[PDB]
Every structure is written in C-alpha cells, then in structure tokens.
Antibody, heavy 221, light 208 residues
Framework: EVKLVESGGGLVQPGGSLKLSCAAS????????MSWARQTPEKKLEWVAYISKGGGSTYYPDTVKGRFTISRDNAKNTLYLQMSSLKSEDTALYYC????????????????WGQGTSVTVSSAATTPPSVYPLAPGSQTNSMVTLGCLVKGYFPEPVTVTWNSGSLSSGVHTFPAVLKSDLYTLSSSVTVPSSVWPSETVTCNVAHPASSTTVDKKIVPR | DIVLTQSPAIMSASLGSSVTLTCSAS?????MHWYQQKSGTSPVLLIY???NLASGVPSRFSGSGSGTFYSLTISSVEASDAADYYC?????????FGGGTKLEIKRADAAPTVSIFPPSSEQLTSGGASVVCFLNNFYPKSINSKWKIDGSERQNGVLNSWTDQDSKDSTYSMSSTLTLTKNEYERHNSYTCEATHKSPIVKSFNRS
C-alpha cells in the first residue's frame, strides 16, 4: 500500500534551520504531486507546502513563504522540507502527504498522510526523562495493572512500549502534561496476575531529542 | 484564508443512530473534503470532492454540500467512529481546514478500575517522590479524582491527563500524578486517591 515515512524532526532554537525528509513507497512517486502539512500543539491542522510532480512549481501559504522550501529528489523517491528562520509558531508535528491531484474529473486532496515527525522551536535545552517503574505497593486481583512514569523531559515527544512491543494489549499511554517547563507522562498495562511477577514485564522508553533510551523492568516491591 | 467553521466542536451520538456534522465557509468554495483523526494516528481521508467515499471507507459515511455550507453524515454510529472530523478545502490558496468536531459515543456509566502506586525506590534516591493513580476504563468522561495525605485532601502538585475515548468499549482512562518532594513524602504515611462522579472507588497505601 501507499506509505510515507517522515524523519528529521527535532528541537531547534528560534531563528534556526532544520531539514525534514519523507521516504515514499507503494506508488509511482514521479507521477504524483506531493505536500507537507502540520498539526500544531493546539491540534489545529495547517497546510504547509505543495510541489509539482517534477519539482518545477511550488506553492506555500503566507505563514511560511520565504522561509520554507519544499523540494523532491525523484531518484531517491524522497520529498524534503527545508525550514529556516524558525519561529515558535512553527512548532508542530509535520506530515508528508501524497497530492493534491486534479484527475478523473475529481479533485483528490492530500492523502495517505505519514505518521509525522515532530519539530519544536524553543530556546530551552533538551532534558532527558527519568523513567520510573510503577509496581503495586501491597495479591488481590486476577488482573494486575503496572505502570511506567516518564518524568521531567523536554521537549515532546517520547515513545513508550511494553516488552519491546510484544505486549500491546491492555495498554493506556496518557498524554503528557507540562509543569515547571518540563513534561511528565505515564503508561499503564494490565496483565493476568499469573503472568507477573512470575514472568518479565518491561517498559521501553525513548526520547530521541536527548538520545535517551530506557528499558525499565517492573519488579515487585 | 477561507475560514471553515465546524460547530458544535463536540457532538454526542448513540450507537446505531445517524448524525450529521457541518462545516460553513467564509467564502463560496467549489468542493469540500473530510478527514477523520483517531487517537495516535494522522488524519485519514474519508470524503473527497464533497460526496465521494475514499478507498476503504464504510458506506455509512456520506457527504453533501454547496456554496458555503457542507456536511458529513454517519448513517448509523459505531463505537469505532469516536474521533475528530475535519473539513478541508483546496479550491483556493491557501488551502484551509476547519477546527474539527469531536464525535463522542454514548454508553452506560462505568466505574473506573483504580490502581495506586507509591514512589519507586529509584525516584526517592533522586530526591523526588511522585505518587501515581490510574483510573481506567470509566464513563462518562467527567470524573473527579481526589488525593488525600494522612486523611486530608491535597490539591496542589496534581497533574491529570485523560486518554481519547476508546474505539472498542467507548470508555475513557485518566492518570493522576501527585508530585511531592522526598522529605515531604517521608513526613506522612497514608496516601489515598478517590475516584468520584455521582459511591467512589478508593485505593490507598501506607508508606510504612
């Protein structure tokens, strides 16, 4: 199927530059126009840029015109977004999208959006998270809920998985909340009491911006 | 710079019923398109060129419109429809999007499964002390969490975060984190978190 994968996001100081990439597959890249869009921290969706199939024409909204340049290298099946003179208003999750296209007497809007790459424009330095295991204090249940506390990091985001991703059922990863300029997030997982602590349960946390990776084992108190 | 207005911002629907979401424009537009955004994923195209269903989209979705007034109709709501819906136009530069309407699914009230956790020995060693409480799989969204230290309510230093509505059972879950200093924590013994709405679910532990 059509797949777009963005990369290149990170923390940048105001006035700085960053180049995003988007690897495409599942369709003939060279015959399609492409675009970039973004979702702001407030969750608003915004169109960012548009480029012709051959790269000969580009379009932008006034908010980024003159600062952002969309480009493509058809030989690499890759789309790019060079950002410069970055502003706090540019902080967002950036998405690569196929289109938009005029065709079959139909107007096809941007589609097959990638899952995105995050960009934060701030003067604050990156702070790695402290990852703590959450184990029951006191068994009294056939299902046991365990957790992972990812505390005091900047900026968003972080990725959390359980048992390298092999444990995906019964999970709730909560949205991060800001306090004193740092984010805190948590994740819970509920498993059969016969599986923990008789067996292993580990929280895998990654914070790309700080080159942080933590595989925290949850052990009984 | 066409403004697309989606009101109400939040709508509630019963399982099996039909609901219509609207999008009004500040300027006449030739066509309107619609996206659906579910928890943790990027927007997915539902309807293009006003009334055409995108590949893989259930037929219970439909769209109509003209001029400055467009709409999206869901013939019979399913639990999986819990999501944000956005209208979009690309007939004129700059391409724009509506603010979105969140569709909430109604279900039976459900008490949360509450789990409380004391600070990890690891955190204590760093000088901090966070107490965590999960309130999982409850309904409605509006729930109140209360922290009590040695029998008295503690209001400051509490961070609460709700998940988006669940696509399968239509419940919500929330995490409440009480942040104290290590000394503060060591100065008290009883820690409790109470979940109430309209009777509560209470969990607690003694530091000692």
């Amino acid at each position: 199927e059509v797949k777009l994968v963005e990369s290149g996001g990170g923390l940048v100081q105001p006035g700085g530059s960053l180049k995003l990439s988007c690897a495409a597959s599942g369709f003939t890249f060279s015959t399609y126009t492409m675009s970039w869009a973004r979702q702001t921290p407030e969750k608003k969706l915004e169109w960012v840029a548009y480029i012709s199939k051959g790269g000969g024409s580009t379009y932008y909204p006034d908010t980024v015109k003159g600062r952002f340049t969309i480009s493509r290298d058809n030989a690499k099946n890759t789309l790019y977004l060079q950002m410069s003179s970055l502003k706090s208003e540019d902080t967002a999750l950036y998405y690569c999208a196929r289109g938009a296209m005029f065709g079959n007497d139909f107007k096809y809007p941007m589609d097959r959006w990638g899952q995105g790459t995050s960009v934060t424009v701030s003067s604050a330095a990156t702070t790695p998270p402290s990852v703590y295991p959450l184990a029951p204090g006191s068994q009294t249940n056939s299902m046991v809920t365990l957790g992972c506390l990812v505390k005091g990091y900047f900026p968003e985001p972080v990725t959390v998985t359980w048992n390298s991703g092999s444990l995906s059922s019964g999970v709730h990863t909560f949205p991060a909340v800001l306090k004193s300029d740092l984010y805190t997030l948590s994740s819970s997982v509920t498993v059969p009491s016969s599986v923990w602590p008789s067996e292993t349960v580990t929280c895998n946390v990654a914070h790309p911006a700080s080159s942080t990776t933590v595989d925290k084992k949850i052990v009984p108190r | 710079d066409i403004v697309l207005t989606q009101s109400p911002a939040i709508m509630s629907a019963s399982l099996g019923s039909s609901v219509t979401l609207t999008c009004s424009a500040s300027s006449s537009v030739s066509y309107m398109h619609w996206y659906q955004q579910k928890s943790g994923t990027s927007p997915v195209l539902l309807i293009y060129t006003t009334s055409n269903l995108a590949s893989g989209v259930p037929s219970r979705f439909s769209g109509s419109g003209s001029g400055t007034f467009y709409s999206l109709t869901i013939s019979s709501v399913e639990a999986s429809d819990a999501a944000d819906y956005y209208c979009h136009q690309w007939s004129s530069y700059p391409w724009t999007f509506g603010g979105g309407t969140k569709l909430e699914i109604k279900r039976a009230d459900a008490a949360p499964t509450v789990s409380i956790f004391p600070p990890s020995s690891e955190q204590l060693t760093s000088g901090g002390a966070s107490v965590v409480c999960f309130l999982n799989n409850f309904y409605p969204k509006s729930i109140n969490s209360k922290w009590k230290i040695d029998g008295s309510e503690r209001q400051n230093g509490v961070l609460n975060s709700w998940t988006d509505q669940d696509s399968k059972d239509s419940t919500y879950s929330m995490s409440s984190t009480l942040t104290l200093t290590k000394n503060e924590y060591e100065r008290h013994n009883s820690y409790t978190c109470e979940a109430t709405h309209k009777s509560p679910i209470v969990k607690s532990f003694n530091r000692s």
